[PDB]
mmCIF file of C-alpha atoms and ligand atoms in Angstrom:
data_model
loop_
_atom_site.group_PDB
_atom_site.id
_atom_site.type_symbol
_atom_site.label_atom_id
_atom_site.label_comp_id
_atom_site.label_asym_id
_atom_site.label_seq_id
_atom_site.Cartn_x
_atom_site.Cartn_y
_atom_site.Cartn_z
ATOM 1 C CA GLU Y 4 -75.377 102.445 322.020
ATOM 2 C CA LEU Y 5 -75.860 104.186 325.723
ATOM 3 C CA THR Y 6 -77.944 107.321 326.865
ATOM 4 C CA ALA Y 7 -76.871 110.238 329.008
ATOM 5 C CA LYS Y 8 -79.451 108.636 331.757
ATOM 6 C CA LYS Y 9 -78.536 105.078 331.047
ATOM 7 C CA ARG Y 10 -75.090 105.412 331.685
ATOM 8 C CA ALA Y 11 -75.903 107.532 334.953
ATOM 9 C CA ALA Y 12 -78.070 104.733 336.170
ATOM 10 C CA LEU Y 13 -75.831 102.368 335.061
ATOM 11 C CA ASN Y 14 -72.879 103.912 337.161
ATOM 12 C CA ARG Y 15 -75.273 104.410 340.230
ATOM 13 C CA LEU Y 16 -76.042 100.809 340.021
ATOM 14 C CA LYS Y 17 -72.432 100.176 340.403
ATOM 15 C CA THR Y 18 -71.964 102.221 343.271
ATOM 16 C CA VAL Y 19 -74.849 100.493 344.938
ATOM 17 C CA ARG Y 20 -73.669 96.934 344.530
ATOM 18 C CA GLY Y 21 -70.236 97.958 346.570
ATOM 19 C CA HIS Y 22 -72.750 99.692 348.884
ATOM 20 C CA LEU Y 23 -74.429 96.350 349.296
ATOM 21 C CA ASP Y 24 -71.459 94.296 349.464
ATOM 22 C CA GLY Y 25 -70.529 96.565 352.687
ATOM 23 C CA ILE Y 26 -74.055 95.976 354.444
ATOM 24 C CA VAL Y 27 -73.404 91.677 353.721
ATOM 25 C CA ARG Y 28 -69.995 92.194 355.389
ATOM 26 C CA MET Y 29 -70.921 94.058 358.459
ATOM 27 C CA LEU Y 30 -74.041 91.822 358.809
ATOM 28 C CA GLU Y 31 -71.795 88.853 358.595
ATOM 29 C CA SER Y 32 -69.816 90.624 361.473
ATOM 30 C CA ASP Y 33 -73.151 90.536 363.091
ATOM 31 C CA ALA Y 34 -72.927 94.161 363.150
ATOM 32 C CA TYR Y 35 -75.263 96.446 365.254
ATOM 33 C CA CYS Y 36 -78.970 96.059 363.884
ATOM 34 C CA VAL Y 37 -79.536 99.803 363.587
ATOM 35 C CA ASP Y 38 -76.476 100.659 361.500
ATOM 36 C CA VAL Y 39 -77.297 97.915 359.042
ATOM 37 C CA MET Y 40 -80.601 99.273 358.791
ATOM 38 C CA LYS Y 41 -79.532 102.743 357.923
ATOM 39 C CA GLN Y 42 -77.246 101.068 355.202
ATOM 40 C CA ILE Y 43 -80.210 99.439 353.715
ATOM 41 C CA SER Y 44 -82.085 102.620 353.448
ATOM 42 C CA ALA Y 45 -79.183 104.364 352.274
ATOM 43 C CA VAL Y 46 -79.214 102.012 349.221
ATOM 44 C CA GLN Y 47 -82.863 102.004 348.635
ATOM 45 C CA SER Y 48 -82.635 105.626 348.206
ATOM 46 C CA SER Y 49 -80.185 105.410 345.618
ATOM 47 C CA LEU Y 50 -82.251 102.569 343.945
ATOM 48 C CA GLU Y 51 -85.166 105.434 344.073
ATOM 49 C CA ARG Y 52 -83.058 108.194 342.247
ATOM 50 C CA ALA Y 53 -81.543 105.413 339.528
ATOM 51 C CA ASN Y 54 -85.046 104.366 339.000
ATOM 52 C CA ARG Y 55 -86.013 107.645 338.105
ATOM 53 C CA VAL Y 56 -83.435 108.612 335.706
ATOM 54 C CA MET Y 57 -84.612 105.627 333.788
ATOM 55 C CA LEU Y 58 -88.073 106.602 333.750
ATOM 56 C CA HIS Y 59 -87.203 109.690 332.959
ATOM 57 C CA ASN Y 60 -84.935 108.307 329.602
ATOM 58 C CA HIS Y 61 -87.869 105.972 329.112
ATOM 59 C CA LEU Y 62 -90.141 108.592 328.755
ATOM 60 C CA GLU Y 63 -88.113 111.138 326.317
ATOM 61 C CA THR Y 64 -87.189 107.711 324.417
ATOM 62 C CA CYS Y 65 -88.877 104.708 323.855
ATOM 63 C CA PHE Y 66 -92.132 106.188 325.436
ATOM 64 C CA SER Y 67 -92.458 109.421 323.241
ATOM 65 C CA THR Y 68 -91.403 107.710 319.992
ATOM 66 C CA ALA Y 69 -94.459 105.401 321.101
ATOM 67 C CA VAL Y 70 -95.915 108.600 318.593
ATOM 68 C CA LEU Y 71 -95.925 106.738 315.441
ATOM 69 C CA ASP Y 72 -98.608 103.109 315.558
ATOM 70 C CA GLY Y 73 -100.227 101.269 318.629
ATOM 71 C CA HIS Y 74 -97.960 103.206 320.696
ATOM 72 C CA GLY Y 75 -100.607 105.045 323.129
ATOM 73 C CA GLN Y 76 -102.265 102.516 325.343
ATOM 74 C CA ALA Y 77 -100.123 99.832 325.360
ATOM 75 C CA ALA Y 78 -96.689 101.792 326.242
ATOM 76 C CA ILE Y 79 -99.059 103.707 328.880
ATOM 77 C CA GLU Y 80 -100.443 100.443 330.090
ATOM 78 C CA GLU Y 81 -97.154 98.631 330.718
ATOM 79 C CA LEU Y 82 -95.180 101.808 331.955
ATOM 80 C CA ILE Y 83 -98.141 101.675 334.658
ATOM 81 C CA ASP Y 84 -97.043 98.181 336.312
ATOM 82 C CA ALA Y 85 -93.263 99.733 336.486
ATOM 83 C CA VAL Y 86 -94.702 102.304 338.701
ATOM 84 C CA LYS Y 87 -95.865 99.667 341.161
ATOM 85 C CA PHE Y 88 -96.453 95.981 340.321
ATOM 86 C CA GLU V 4 -73.238 85.122 367.569
ATOM 87 C CA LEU V 5 -75.927 85.303 364.836
ATOM 88 C CA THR V 6 -79.404 85.401 365.021
ATOM 89 C CA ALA V 7 -82.470 83.693 363.588
ATOM 90 C CA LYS V 8 -83.366 87.124 361.917
ATOM 91 C CA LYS V 9 -79.841 88.654 361.134
ATOM 92 C CA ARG V 10 -78.779 85.252 359.248
ATOM 93 C CA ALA V 11 -81.990 85.478 357.142
ATOM 94 C CA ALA V 12 -81.685 89.276 356.121
ATOM 95 C CA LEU V 13 -78.105 88.200 355.602
ATOM 96 C CA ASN V 14 -79.304 85.732 352.940
ATOM 97 C CA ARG V 15 -81.560 87.751 351.461
ATOM 98 C CA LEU V 16 -79.245 90.513 351.174
ATOM 99 C CA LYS V 17 -76.867 87.989 349.623
ATOM 100 C CA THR V 18 -79.424 87.376 347.357
ATOM 101 C CA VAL V 19 -80.139 90.875 346.273
ATOM 102 C CA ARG V 20 -76.458 91.526 345.459
ATOM 103 C CA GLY V 21 -76.947 88.958 342.505
ATOM 104 C CA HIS V 22 -80.200 90.458 341.454
ATOM 105 C CA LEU V 23 -78.169 93.758 341.475
ATOM 106 C CA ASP V 24 -75.499 91.871 339.134
ATOM 107 C CA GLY V 25 -78.108 91.065 336.663
ATOM 108 C CA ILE V 26 -79.221 94.732 336.519
ATOM 109 C CA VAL V 27 -75.641 96.048 336.065
ATOM 110 C CA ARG V 28 -75.151 93.756 333.316
ATOM 111 C CA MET V 29 -78.767 94.173 331.314
ATOM 112 C CA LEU V 30 -77.934 98.154 331.963
ATOM 113 C CA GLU V 31 -74.525 97.441 330.408
ATOM 114 C CA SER V 32 -76.351 96.069 327.437
ATOM 115 C CA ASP V 33 -78.226 98.958 326.963
ATOM 116 C CA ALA V 34 -81.524 96.898 328.226
ATOM 117 C CA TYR V 35 -84.924 97.811 327.510
ATOM 118 C CA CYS V 36 -85.973 100.644 329.777
ATOM 119 C CA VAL V 37 -88.960 99.230 331.534
ATOM 120 C CA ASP V 38 -87.609 95.627 332.173
ATOM 121 C CA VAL V 39 -84.550 97.229 334.023
ATOM 122 C CA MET V 40 -87.282 99.658 336.221
ATOM 123 C CA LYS V 41 -88.839 96.452 337.165
ATOM 124 C CA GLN V 42 -85.808 94.672 338.317
ATOM 125 C CA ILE V 43 -84.729 97.628 340.211
ATOM 126 C CA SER V 44 -88.409 97.542 341.675
ATOM 127 C CA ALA V 45 -87.735 93.628 342.435
ATOM 128 C CA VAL V 46 -84.560 94.609 344.613
ATOM 129 C CA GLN V 47 -86.025 97.282 346.285
ATOM 130 C CA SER V 48 -89.370 95.133 347.672
ATOM 131 C CA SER V 49 -86.618 92.577 349.057
ATOM 132 C CA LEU V 50 -84.625 95.350 350.733
ATOM 133 C CA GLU V 51 -87.966 96.557 352.447
ATOM 134 C CA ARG V 52 -88.503 92.746 353.680
ATOM 135 C CA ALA V 53 -84.731 92.281 355.147
ATOM 136 C CA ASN V 54 -84.824 95.970 356.797
ATOM 137 C CA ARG V 55 -87.957 94.754 358.468
ATOM 138 C CA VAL V 56 -86.829 91.481 359.923
ATOM 139 C CA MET V 57 -83.934 93.809 361.011
ATOM 140 C CA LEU V 58 -86.386 95.768 362.848
ATOM 141 C CA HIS V 59 -88.061 93.177 364.122
ATOM 142 C CA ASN V 60 -84.530 91.346 365.571
ATOM 143 C CA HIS V 61 -83.442 94.841 367.006
ATOM 144 C CA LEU V 62 -86.640 95.059 369.219
ATOM 145 C CA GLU V 63 -86.687 91.930 370.520
ATOM 146 C CA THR V 64 -82.989 92.196 370.720
ATOM 147 C CA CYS V 65 -80.918 95.284 371.562
ATOM 148 C CA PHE V 66 -84.042 97.431 371.896
ATOM 149 C CA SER V 67 -85.764 95.272 374.611
ATOM 150 C CA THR V 68 -82.873 94.950 376.856
ATOM 151 C CA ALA V 69 -82.546 98.888 376.823
ATOM 152 C CA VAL V 70 -84.838 97.825 379.541
ATOM 153 C CA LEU V 71 -81.979 98.294 382.310
ATOM 154 C CA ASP V 72 -80.683 101.533 382.533
ATOM 155 C CA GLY V 73 -80.497 104.963 380.166
ATOM 156 C CA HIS V 74 -82.165 102.656 377.432
ATOM 157 C CA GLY V 75 -85.700 104.285 377.138
ATOM 158 C CA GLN V 76 -85.438 107.826 375.309
ATOM 159 C CA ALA V 77 -81.880 107.296 373.819
ATOM 160 C CA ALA V 78 -83.023 103.942 371.881
ATOM 161 C CA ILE V 79 -86.199 105.191 370.782
ATOM 162 C CA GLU V 80 -84.899 108.431 369.428
ATOM 163 C CA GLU V 81 -82.209 106.802 367.356
ATOM 164 C CA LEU V 82 -84.324 104.213 366.562
ATOM 165 C CA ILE V 83 -86.453 106.697 364.844
ATOM 166 C CA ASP V 84 -83.707 108.205 362.174
ATOM 167 C CA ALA V 85 -83.348 104.445 361.238
ATOM 168 C CA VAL V 86 -87.066 104.656 360.195
ATOM 169 C CA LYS V 87 -86.530 107.601 357.864
ATOM 170 C CA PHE V 88 -83.354 110.053 357.925
HETATM 171 CU CU1 CU1 H 1 -87.261 102.924 327.002
HETATM 172 CU CU1 CU1 H 2 -80.121 95.338 367.517
#
């Protein structure tokens, strides 16, 4: 069943797929380079926001409750690739 | 009519919209946070590549042929917002 944050991330993502459609569309109509470039940047910024809600969800959620057991090093170590790999 | 670079940017973008679908889908199935986070990052990296092909197209294209006339300052000045605004 679906979190606070995971819902919003999801809706954010849905919103971004439509944003993407628009860009695909204008590129298809041989749109002005700079305009396309700025849409693409708008999309990336929304992606950044969604990813950080994710992280945030993850930390209080799966991350924390690597309280009990092997948690610790493994949760961290793999958390690290998802920041940049 | 459609450029070298603008074609590829377009196909890249089309590819990314499908990538996005997948993410929307897994989030809908309450997917593992980290996995989702890493897809989202994969999408952003492809966006970065597409944007730079754009830039590259723009520079040889509309940017350059602000050779003649008021070109110069205006093309540059507005080019600058599309790097970060
Ligand atoms: Cu998680
Ligand atoms: Cu251009």
